[PDB]
C-alpha cells in the first residue's frame, strides 16, 4: 500500500540496536521501531564516503 | 579491577547488603558484550535479588 | 512480567497460556461428561418418583 524509507547514519556498534523490539540508547531516546514492526532493515559501511 | 584472576582459578566476589544500580552499567558503552539469560537487562532496576 | 521484556515475555506467556488453556479444555470436557451422567441419573430418578 505504501513504503516509508527511514534514512539516517549511526556508528557501527548500534546496528544491532535497530532491530525491531530492541532496546538501547538509540532504540530508547531517538529512534524506536514498533514491536509489531514489519519491513526491512538495511545498513552499510560509509567510512569511505 | 587493576588485575583479574585466570580461568583455572576464576575469581568469585560475593555481593550482598548493598543497593545496586544496573542502569548505570547498562547506559555505559564500554560493554562490548552484555547478555542476560534469565532476566531482561532493562528490568534489573525493578527486580530485587 | 517482572523479569522479562515484551518480546520474550510473549514467548513465555504463550506457553503458559497454551498449558492453562489445555487444562481448561480437559476440565470442561470432564464436566460435560459428568453432567451427562448426572442427567441420565436424574431422569431415572424422576421416572422412579
Amino acid at each position: 500500500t505504501n513504503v516509508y524509507a527511514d534514512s539516517f547514519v549511526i556508528r557501527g556498534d548500534e546496528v544491532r540496536q535497530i532491530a525491531p523490539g530492541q532496546t538501547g540508547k538509540i532504540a530508547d531516546y531517538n529512534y524506536k521501531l514498533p514491536d509489531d514492526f514489519t519491513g526491512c532493515v538495511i545498513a552499510w559501511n560509509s567510512n569511505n564516503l | 579491577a587493576t588485575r583479574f584472576a585466570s580461568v583455572y582459578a576464576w575469581n568469585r566476589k560475593r555481593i550482598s547488603n548493598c543497593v545496586a544500580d544496573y542502569s548505570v552499567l547498562y547506559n555505559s558503552a564500554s560493554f562490548s558484550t552484555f547478555k542476560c539469560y534469565g532476566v531482561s537487562p532493562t528490568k534489573l532496576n525493578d527486580l530485587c535479588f | 512480567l517482572s523479569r522479562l521484556d515484551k518480546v520474550e515475555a510473549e514467548v513465555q506467556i504463550d506457553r503458559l497460556i497454551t498449558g492453562r488453556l489445555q487444562s481448561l479444555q480437559t476440565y470442561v470436557t470432564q464436566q460435560l461428561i459428568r453432567a451427562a451422567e448426572i442427567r441420565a441419573s436424574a431422569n431415572l430418578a424422576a421416572t422412579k418418583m
Side-chain angles (χ1 to χ4, degrees), chain C residues 32-49:
Chain C
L32 273 179
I33 290 174
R34 213 82 72 198
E37 277 308 332
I38 293 305
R39 186 74 169 90
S41 181
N43 264 357
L44 176 57
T47 288
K48 304 242 192 197
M49 190 76 108

Side-chain angles (χ1 to χ4, degrees), chain B residues 1-45:
Chain B
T2 50
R3 298 289 173 183
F4 272 27
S6 285
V7 297
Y8 74 93
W10 55 276
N11 185 40
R12 168 152 262 184
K13 169 148 165 182
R14 118 167 241 79
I15 279 107
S16 64
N17 198 16
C18 51
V19 174
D21 208 350
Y22 302 99
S23 78
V24 174
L25 279 77
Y26 191 60
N27 298 337
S28 182
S30 64
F31 298 113
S32 71
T33 299
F34 63 93
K35 294 182 176 180
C36 302
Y37 292 91
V39 58
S40 174
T42 64
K43 274 294 196 176
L44 286 169
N45 287 87

Side-chain angles (χ1 to χ4, degrees), chain C:
Chain C
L1 183 63
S2 303
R3 309 258 283 288
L4 322 178
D5 196 76
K6 276 74 69 177
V7 76
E8 58 253 88
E10 278 166 86
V11 173
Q12 305 301 312
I13 211 176
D14 291 331
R15 187 180 290 268
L16 287 177
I17 282 171
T18 298
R20 273 125 181 206
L21 183 63
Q22 184 184 22
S23 68
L24 268 176
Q25 293 336 99
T26 300
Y27 169 77
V28 175
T29 293
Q30 296 299 136
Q31 285 300 282
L32 273 179
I33 290 174
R34 213 82 72 198
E37 277 308 332
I38 293 305
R39 186 74 169 90
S41 181
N43 264 357
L44 176 57
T47 288
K48 304 242 192 197
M49 190 76 108

Side-chain angles (χ1 to χ4, degrees), chain A residues 11 13 16 23-25 28-29, chain B residues 26-27 29 31-32 34 41-42:
Chain A
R11 45 183 293 185
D13 184 1
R16 273 82 68 193
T23 174
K25 187 158 48 59
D28 288 344
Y29 302 140
Chain B
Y26 191 60
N27 298 337
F31 298 113
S32 71
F34 63 93
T42 64

